């Protein structure tokens, strides 16, 4: 397989169907990444709902075990048991809400968890992300608050773009990662179309593999998100992969394809199995709520989940209610095929250019 | 099949292997029964794992989701989906140690999650067993304390020889538990050979379908308990099944079965395996421990588990180290695999002649 290659096989309107070749595997696009370990599931059940990629946190991995004790230990699909594409963040965002002094060069933040200071910059953070052994690396940017004035997503939009460029080169200095895995920017420019044109155009300038689109899902609503994306993805370039990071609910997700967005990650599906939120197409439910405590039907009654094949809402409600580790692992599995199986509709209906129906349908079932 | 036969195949001395049929399945012994929801365990994991039965716990599934619910939506099998038989202990013993005013009658308690108050009896339990749909039911009877003068131990045990006889009046009232489940008998007694001696004289003339050895671990250390089951083993029907019931290490159990004894449960390797203690034959070894962080090798590295196909000790420490459940969902699979590996080795040796030799083997390097 080649390092990198994005096929589109199929389009209407903005949206697109393809897949990205790299030589751990396939990418099927649009394509939803679990977030990783994926909590409460091994690396074969995450596989089995249908994820062709996964993504690693650099943040959490940098802290423990750390980025040089997994290489050491062969790399992170190695270390965990996941041997197709993962694609890695940044570090950057969990620096800004989770751990600080920043600079032109990069941040020193102290461990959340033994307040240890550390560092990330550029050239750190593509290096981590080599030692990581990531197939998809993400450049380092600096995020943009929300609200911004535009001043300051100026100054943000700025430095993260010079930022883009110290990623780029760093990179391509490293011939084993330059050679094997493949780099995407990050355009930036919070809500304002002339600032996202600055930075599509310098990100499209140095070059990158794919393209996310960043700054969003950070508290402005999804009107305000499909907004910007209306404008916003048409500057990147088209015949690369967008990426809409940290995003997110089966509406927003069917909502951004429609805008021209490839491939999307969020914990939500994780982090809402263990919470008791699970998807169905008629809308998410509780499943801590009383109303299932007797009731005898799956989750959903068109998944086709190892969840739904086996156990009752009733069963899952008592695991969760009793605060058992079996009751995360089935919600999260059930969670995770859900999103697999949108995807695999998403892509079916885009094929057959019956996506417009498709999101029309989708919405006034799940709104119903 | 049967409602229950005990065929004994081979013998050693005082050890014995066979086989119990009863309608759900077919039980290999001296057998090992994990303790139920298996915690991080899908039922397909245990059963891929070598268990033949597990052991519901009655006293926390009366609290929740409660034995009427369990029963209504179709029993314990069909709610958490396995197959196989199922043994329930009596409740007593829970209580008497998690939730008081005892009487000839029974136990009333206040629940240790809710304050509400419940009531078992030798009738009650029998009839929560029944409405869990357990295959192998165990008479209630009245726990000893370690250490127990002669008159506290022999009033307990008397009393517990009453309740034994309304614990087979109720199973036997009970149409379609009396022809589809088998009920055992619990020898009490505490360190006392009369006592022992009057007690199995007791359950074998009212007559079970297998007897335990109760009173045993609760405090009175390996020494005392292998001179207890020295001469109280043999007193119970040697053609019926033996259950020490809470016990334990992988060295108590070789010691016990050098005296009679089949059956065994205990929450050891999964509440170690959340706890970081993983079993090998080289002893136990505590995977949170600093030496194991860059340790490449396999929890045991004769284990035929999945979890040693595929995953490193360092990989596991990471894992519990940071509180993921996928450390427990592995830790437990290894651990749950690890006994019932060292039951077929026993079963194996018994059939062979060769048990001795195994014992004397496996404790020169368990213990090196
Ligand atoms: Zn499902
Ligand atoms: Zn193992």
Chains 1, 2 share one sequence.
């Not at 050491?72 to 993962?86: A, E, Q, V």
């Not at 995407?184 to 600055?198: A, C, D, K, P, T």
């Not at 086709?304 to 079996?326: F, M, N, T």
Request: with cysteine.
């Amino acid at each position: 397989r080649p390092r990198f290659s994005f096929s589109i096989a199929a389009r209407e309107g903005k949206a697109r169907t393809g897949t990205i070749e790299m030589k751990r595997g396939v990418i099927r696009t649009p394509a939803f990444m679990p977030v990783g370990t994926v909590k409460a599931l091994k690396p074969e059940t995450v596989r089995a709902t249908g994820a062709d990629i996964i993504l690693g946190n650099t943040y959490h991995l940098m802290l423990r075990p750390g980025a040089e004790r997994i290489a050491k230990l062969g790399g992170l699909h190695s270390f965990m048991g996941w041997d197709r594409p993962i694609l890695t963040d940044s570090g950057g965002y969990q620096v800004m809400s989770l751990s600080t002094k920043q600079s032109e060069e990069g941040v020193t933040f102290k461990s959340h968890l033994d307040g240890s200071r550390h560092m990330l910059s550029p050239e750190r953070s593509i290096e981590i992300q080599h030692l990581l052994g990531s197939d998809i690396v993400m450049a380092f940017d600096e995020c943009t608050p929300y609200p911004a004035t535009p001043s300051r997503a100026a100054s943000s939009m700025e430095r993260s773009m010079r930022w883009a460029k110290r990623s780029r080169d760093a990179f391509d200095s490293r011939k084993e990662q330059a050679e094997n895995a493949a780099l995407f920017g990050i355009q930036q420019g919070s809500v304002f179309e002339n600032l996202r044109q600055q930075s599509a155009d310098a990100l499209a300038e140095i070059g990158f593999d794919g393209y996310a689109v960043g700054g969003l899902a950070v508290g402005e609503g999804q009107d305000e998100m499909f907004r910007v994306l209306d404008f916003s993805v048409p500057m990147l370039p088209d015949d690369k992969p967008h990426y809409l990071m940290g995003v997110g609910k089966p509406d927003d997700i069917v909502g951004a394809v429609e805008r021209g967005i490839d491939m999307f990650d969020c914990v939500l599906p994780t982090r809402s199995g263990r919470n008791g939120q699970a998807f169905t197409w008629d809308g998410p439910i509780n499943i801590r709520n009383a109303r299932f405590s007797e009731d005898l039907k799956p989750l959903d009654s068109e998944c086709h989940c190892a969840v739904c094949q086996k156990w009752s809402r009733a069963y899952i409600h008592a695991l969760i209610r009793a605060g058992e580790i079996l009751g995360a692992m089935l919600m999260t599995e059930h969670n995770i095929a859900f999103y697999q199986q949108l995807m695999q509709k998403i892509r079916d209906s885009i094929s057959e250019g019956r996506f417009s129906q498709f999101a029309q349908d989708f919405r006034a079932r799940y709104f119903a």
